[PDB]
Nucleic acid binder design. Structure first.
Ligand SMILES: [Cl-]
Ligand SMILES: [Cl-]
Ligand SMILES: [Cl-]
Ligand SMILES: [Cl-]
Ligand SMILES: [Cl-]
Ligand SMILES: [Cl-]
Ligand SMILES: [Cl-]
Ligand SMILES: [Mg+2]
Ligand SMILES: [Mg+2]
Ligand SMILES: [Mg+2]
Ligand SMILES: [Mg+2]
Ligand SMILES: [Mg+2]
Ligand SMILES: [Mg+2]
Ligand SMILES: [Mg+2]
Ligand SMILES: [Mg+2]
Ligand SMILES: [Mg+2]
Ligand SMILES: [Mg+2]
Ligand SMILES: [Mg+2]
Ligand SMILES: [Mg+2]
Ligand SMILES: [Mg+2]
Ligand SMILES: [Mg+2]
Ligand code: NA
Ligand code: NA
Ligand code: NA
Ligand code: NA
Ligand code: NA
Ligand code: NA
Ligand code: NA
Ligand code: NA
Ligand code: NA
Ligand code: NA
Ligand code: NA
Ligand code: NA
Ligand code: NA
Ligand code: NA
Ligand code: NA
Ligand SMILES: [Sr+2]
Ligand SMILES: [Sr+2]
Ligand SMILES: [Sr+2]
Ligand SMILES: [Sr+2]
Ligand SMILES: [Sr+2]
Ligand SMILES: [Sr+2]
Ligand SMILES: [Sr+2]
Ligand SMILES: [Sr+2]
Ligand SMILES: [Sr+2]
Ligand SMILES: [Sr+2]
Ligand SMILES: [Sr+2]
Ligand SMILES: [Sr+2]
Ligand SMILES: [Sr+2]
Ligand SMILES: [Sr+2]
Lengths: 150, 142, 49, 142
RNA sequence: ACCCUCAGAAGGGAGGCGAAAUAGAGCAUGAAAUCAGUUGGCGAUCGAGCGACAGGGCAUACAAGGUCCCUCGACGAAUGACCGACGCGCGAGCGUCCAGUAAGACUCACGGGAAGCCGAUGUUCUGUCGUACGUUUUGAAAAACGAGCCAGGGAGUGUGUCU
RNA sequence: CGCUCUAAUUGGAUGGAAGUAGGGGUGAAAACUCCUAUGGACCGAUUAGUGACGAAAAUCCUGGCCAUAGUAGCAGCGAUA
RNA sequence: UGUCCCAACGUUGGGCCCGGUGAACUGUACAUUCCAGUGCGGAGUCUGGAGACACCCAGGGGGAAGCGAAGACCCUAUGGA
């Protein structure tokens, strides 16, 4: 697994991590990218709106075949990865929780750092025609989050 | 609309190719040039053969495109572009500091460059950019 | 006999594969193959005196 | 309060005029990189030099632009070949006894990296007292 | 261990041990391919063997390199004048003298200057040259053959006899 | 020039060896060397030997990995649930 | 008698958008191309011009002498059956 890739001052910072989550790594990059810089509370409201289908997540890199979305700003393609979003909600829940336990105002802290990393693949096999089988794997994702006082 | 040209050239009764060649040279040397009275510039030869050539350029083309100008305005500028490495930085800079005009939008009168003048009293086989344009189908707006 | 204890055979042309002896889908015997024989190894018969 | 290097750090060797001239030539002329052909085109191909052997090799055939091919003609002047840029001739040192026989006016010493701090400290104070510069000195806060 | 979080013997946070947890379980070290985040350079009007050599922009903690720039002067190879005077040519122009002079690459000395400043490194721009590599072939950029990428593996060896 | 192990001669290392990463110097070059970080236990030089000694390539071998792609499939069958 | 003149409208399952799951083929490199030319005479990459602001969605497949298979034809081998 990963280690925080950025330095953090414990006196004004709170951390959290997800480990080996079996979810789209591609969706995770998109989501991290979008919520970085937001406040914990804003990220949460944003992600809940994504799961509800009212706010799309811009897909700027892993966008092949993706339909355009009018609400996407400065870009065209977007989607509503609800699964990876719920995983990020757990992460934020943990982050804000730690934040408060330390005396900070969790919800109000800025998402200073958030990145997803592919830590591996849960391997699977899928039978195919002509007597052969091909890969059918699950991505394994770790994600780091650092909250910081305004 | 306003072009601080260091040089204003008068193409009236002047051999297009010879003026073009000098305007390119100056443009490459940093001069801002305005060619005036382009419709009165001239090209020697038999009108019928000259027109056949410019009409061929008009008819050439396809999806990728071969947009050839019909106005004396553009004919002349294209002529100049072919004497400049317009796809290189310096070449595009030179080409972009050169403008051609129908008539004379300035208050000064352009100067006649040496060696580019055509003596109408000694020549009958030549045509006018304006005449070529009209034949090409351009809308005589000059 | 190191690396030679295998009935590995090459499939020849036809399956878009190099003509390398294989057994159970594994390349074997030849020197360029992992687990294959040593091409010109140390030999006991050599006179070292 | 600040870092200082031990020994005769600023010392310069004394060279004949001809050696200073040739040392200056070597430094002015330099040489090509001499990296293997196409090392930049494929990660699996390192920069370490290899004679291009392809029958059709562009570099082998000496085509201008494909890089120079190693030839004796590129050798540096014998009188200066191998000298540190300072002008000193280097002497590899592993212990204090290696300092014996070294001319601090013509040679500078280089302590092998393997040597530890304890042995380096002794080597460094003994070299300074012998008038020998140490190319890779220890920096202490003084 | 204890505590917090969580649906939770999961995971996370804080904490404890140890010289080291970036030694926390296929748990010494931890390359490349490659992925995330990010720094420098370039970037939505512009062209393709991706570079080599020159020269500019921007970028650079220390250490392991310390040079570099401008006035002037000294030296000064090949080469080599302007101007002026005189004389020729229809003319473009040339001859003789000034003169193998002034100039002339490198190098050096005096005086002044630079420390991102000189080298170097990263990237980019300009100039010149440039259609991979290996093989097959009279002829390969080839619309001839090989390779997705990287690491590791991968081909003149032994006995006898002869020369 | 470089690699393995042997021998003689002779050195380095917990006051930090090998390796790795980034960087400085030398050599026409093979390649040598130093600095910093990591690492935490081994490492050289010279000389005479030794050889399962050097890779860009063989539809080469094995392992790992990227683009392909969040794409094809998860509809079609007289059993539409 | 929609085989045809000559095609139209409709039905069901796909196709398209969304959640989840999630492969393979293929990949020397570079690659926005077009017209001509040149070249081992069948060029996105050479030359000259022309055109060309970046990215994305859907499509039918013109080109990559497309991908797949060391041509089964033909010949050659002091080859096999
Ligand atoms: Cl993925
Ligand atoms: Cl057209
Ligand atoms: Cl151009
Ligand atoms: Cl006439
Ligand atoms: Cl030599
Ligand atoms: Cl000199
Ligand atoms: Cl041999
Ligand atoms: Mg789509
Ligand atoms: Mg079956
Ligand atoms: Mg074996
Ligand atoms: Mg390389
Ligand atoms: Mg480990
Ligand atoms: Mg080879
Ligand atoms: Mg042939
Ligand atoms: Mg010895
Ligand atoms: Mg190897
Ligand atoms: Mg596709
Ligand atoms: Mg039914
Ligand atoms: Mg065949
Ligand atoms: Mg037959
Ligand atoms: Mg037979
Ligand atoms: Na993208
Ligand atoms: Na939009
Ligand atoms: Na929008
Ligand atoms: Na003419
Ligand atoms: Na046209
Ligand atoms: Na066996
Ligand atoms: Na024996
Ligand atoms: Na530069
Ligand atoms: Na061949
Ligand atoms: Na070739
Ligand atoms: Na060809
Ligand atoms: Na593949
Ligand atoms: Na293959
Ligand atoms: Na019908
Ligand atoms: Na097609
Ligand atoms: Sr994309
Ligand atoms: Sr001229
Ligand atoms: Sr066959
Ligand atoms: Sr050391
Ligand atoms: Sr801890
Ligand atoms: Sr002289
Ligand atoms: Sr390899
Ligand atoms: Sr790394
Ligand atoms: Sr070998
Ligand atoms: Sr994949
Ligand atoms: Sr169904
Ligand atoms: Sr079916
Ligand atoms: Sr071109
Ligand atoms: Sr289609």
């Amino acid at each position: 697994g990963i280690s925080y890739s950025v330095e953090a001052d414990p006196d004004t910072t709170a951390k959290a991590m997800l480990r080996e989550r079996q979810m789209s790594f591609k969706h995770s990059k998109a989501i991290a990218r979008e919520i970085k810089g937001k406040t914990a509370g804003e990220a949460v409201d944003y992600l809940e709106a994504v799961i509800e289908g009212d706010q799309p997540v811009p897909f700027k890199q892993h966008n092949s075949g993706v339909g355009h979305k009018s609400k996407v700003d400065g870009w065209d393609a977007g989607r509503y990865p609800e699964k990876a979003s719920k995983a990020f909600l757990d992460l934020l829940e943990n982050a804000v929780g730690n934040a408060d336990h330390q005396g900070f105002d969790g919800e109000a802290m800025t998402i200073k750092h958030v990145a997803a990393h592919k830590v591996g693949e849960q391997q699977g096999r899928k039978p195919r025609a002509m007597g052969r089988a091909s890969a059918w794997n699950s991505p394994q994702v770790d994600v780091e989050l650092i909250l910081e006082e305004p | 609309a306003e072009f601080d040209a260091d040089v204003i050239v008068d193409a009236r009764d002047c051999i297009m190719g010879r003026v073009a060649s000098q305007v390119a040279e100056q443009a490459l040397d940093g001069e801002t040039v305005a060619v005036v009275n382009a419709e009165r510039a001239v090209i020697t030869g038999r009108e019928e053969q000259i027109v056949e050539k410019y009409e061929k350029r008009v008819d050439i083309g396809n999806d990728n495109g071969y947009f050839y100008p019909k106005r004396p305005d553009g004919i002349f500028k294209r002529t100049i572009r072919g004497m400049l490495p317009h796809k290189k930085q310096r070449g595009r800079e030179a080409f972009e500091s050169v403008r051609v005009y129908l008539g004379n939008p300035y208050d000064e009168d352009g100067e006649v460059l040496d060696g580019t003048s055509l003596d109408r009293l000694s020549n009958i086989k030549f045509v006018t950019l304006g005449e070529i344009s009209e034949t090409l189908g351009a809308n005589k707006t000059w | 006999y190191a690396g030679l204890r295998t009935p590995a055979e090459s499939f020849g042309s036809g399956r878009g594969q190099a003509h390398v002896p294989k057994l159970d889908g594994r390349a074997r015997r030849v020197p360029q193959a992992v687990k294959g024989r040593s091409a010109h190894p140390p030999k006991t018969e050599k006179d070292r005196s | 309060t600040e870092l200082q290097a031990r020994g005769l750090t600023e010392k310069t060797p004394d060279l004949s005029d001809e050696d200073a001239r040739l040392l200056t030539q070597r430094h002015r002329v330099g040489k090509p990189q001499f990296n293997r052909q196409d090392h930049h085109k494929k990660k699996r191909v390192s920069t370490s030099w290899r004679k291009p052997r392809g029958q059709l090799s562009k570099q082998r055939r000496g085509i201008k632009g494909k890089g120079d091919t190693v030839e004796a003609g590129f050798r540096s002047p014998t009188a200066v070949r191998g000298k540190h840029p300072s002008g000193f001739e280097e002497v590899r040192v592993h212990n204090v006894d290696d300092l014996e026989g070294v001319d601090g006016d013509t040679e500078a010493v280089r302590i092998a990296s393997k040597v530890g701090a304890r042995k380096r400290e002794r080597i460094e104070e003994e070299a300074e007292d012998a008038g020998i510069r140490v190319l890779n000195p220890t920096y202490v806060e003084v």
